[PDB]
Design a protein around this ligand. Structure first.
Ligand code: RET
Length: 227
């Protein structure tokens, strides 16, 4: 098939795989129960991403959606990855600041809406309606980020500075990275079709790897994970 974006797909597979392994290797040596909690969640995240980059590298997770007078190439495997990796990353942040169950439930629930409406949008055939779903998915994301910035940060204040300072770094990387996804979608293949798929795949790989392995490295090399 030889598509232009495959090299970016091979590179995402490689980074996710390696990252996952190292997390698994480091996770199975630790004995602290709480540290175990965090290690298992954080290793699972790039492990799911790896299997999906792999499938996409191999020709799966792609569909031609008609709109704008074109047969548009939409990588839906992406949302199958994010459906489970985005709430797991949220879970990691919540366990860190001892968020309440209702908060977690409501954050995981807003995240299901975001990915769900996002995919519906990336699958929608009436061009302008693609942006209506996109708009709702983004409002869901702004809800989640509001909660991470205003709620959590506040709770990380009952924690010790080492823990509060690790959370603020992960919160910052998360707000910066997640903010970028909706803009990539908008000017890329699912949206305006301004940025081509190969470049678009590159941006998504950089955001995904940063948000999973980048995030994981920061979290797991910290002392805040300990019970
Ligand atoms: C490992 C993956 C991460 C941290 C993915 C984050 C993905 C997002 C924040 C995605 C957001 C989207 C929107 C706000 C609207 C349009 C569609 C999405 C799903 C790309």
């Amino acid at each position: 098939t030889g598509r232009p974006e495959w090299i970016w797909l091979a590179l995402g597979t490689a980074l996710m795989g390696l990252g996952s392994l190292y997390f698994l290797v480091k996770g199975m040596g630790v004995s602290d129960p709480d540290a175990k909690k965090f290690y298992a969640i954080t290793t699972l995240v790039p492990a799911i991403a790896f299997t999906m980059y792999l499938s996409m590298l191999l020709g799966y997770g792609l569909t031609m959606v008609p709109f704008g007078g074109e047969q548009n190439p939409i990588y839906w495997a992406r949302y199958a990855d994010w459906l489970f990796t985005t709430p797991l990353l949220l879970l990691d942040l919540a366990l860190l600041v001892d968020a309440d169950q209702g908060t977690i439930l409501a954050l995981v629930g807003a995240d299901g809406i975001m990915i769900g409406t996002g995919l519906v949008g990336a699958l929608t055939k009436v061009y302008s309606y693609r942006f209506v779903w996109w708009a709702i998915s983004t409002a869901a994301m702004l809800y989640i980020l509001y909660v991470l910035f205003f709620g959590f940060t506040s709770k990380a204040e009952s924690m010790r500075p080492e823990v509060a300072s690790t959370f603020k770094v992960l919160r910052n990387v998360t707000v910066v990275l997640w903010s970028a996804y909706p803009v990539v979608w908008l000017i890329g293949s699912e949206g305006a079709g301004i940025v081509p798929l190969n470049i678009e795949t590159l941006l998504f790989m950089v955001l995904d790897v940063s948000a999973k392995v980048g995030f994981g490295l920061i979290l797991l090399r910290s002392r805040a994970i300990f019970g």
